Amino acid sequence: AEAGITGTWYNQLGSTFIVTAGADGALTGTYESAVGNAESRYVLTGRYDSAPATDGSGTALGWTVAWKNNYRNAHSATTWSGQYVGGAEARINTQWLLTSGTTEANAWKSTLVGHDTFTKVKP
Amino acid sequence: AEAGITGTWYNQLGSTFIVTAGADGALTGTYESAVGNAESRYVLTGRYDSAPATDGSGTALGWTVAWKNNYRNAHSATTWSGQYVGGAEARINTQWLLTSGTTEANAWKSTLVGHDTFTKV
C-alpha cells in the first residue's frame, strides 16, 4: 500500500532511503550513503505495484540511483528490485545490480550484484 | 545431444573451455584464459542433467573454476549456470557469478555477474 512504503528506511550497511509512494505506482525520494555528512544524498526514482494481491504476498517494486549529485560523480548506477512486506516490522527485501560505465574492454566486469534488507524507521 | 557437451568451446572473450561429460552427470575439464598461453589453464568441475526432458528443452548445467593454478592465484572463483542446446549450432548459454575473497568491509562488493555464450567455433 503506498502509505506503508512511504517513510524512512535503513539497510544493514547504514544507508538511508527516504521514499514517497504516489497513487500512480511512482516512487520518488533520496538515497544517502552510510553515515558520512549531508552531501551524500542522491535522487532515486522507481515504481511499485499499487494494487498488490490479499493475501500475505509482498508488493513488488524497484528503484534506481545514478551516483552523481553536485559534489560527486561515481559514474555508476544501481537498481534494487524486491518486495515490500508490511506488518508491525515492515521490511523491503531486495537484490541489486550496480553497473559502472566502462570501456569496451572492461565491460565484462562492469556489474556487481548483492542484496540489502531495509527496515522502516519513520513515516 | 547428450554427450554433445563433450568438446572444446569458445566464448566471445576468447577463453577456451574443454570438457568431458560423464554418463552420470559429471563435468570435468580445463578452462584456459587469454592468449591461449601455457598456464592460463585452470581446472573446472561441474554437473549437468544426464536425463534432460524429452521435450525440445536445453540441458541444465553449471561448473566452477577457482582462479588458482601453479603459477597464479587471483583469490576468486567463478560459477557458470546455464543450459546446453544442441543442433547444427550447439551453444551453451550462461550467466555467471565471480566472487573474490575480501575482508568484511568489502564483502558488499565481492561479486560480479555477467553472461557468456559458448560455441564450438
Binding site: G14, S33, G36, S40, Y42, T78, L98 | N106, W108, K109
Partner: peptide
C-alpha cells in the same frame, strides 16, 4: 563508493 559502508 556511496553504496558501501563508511571507510576505515
Amino acid at each position: 563508493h556511496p553504496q558501501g559502508p563508511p571507510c576505515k
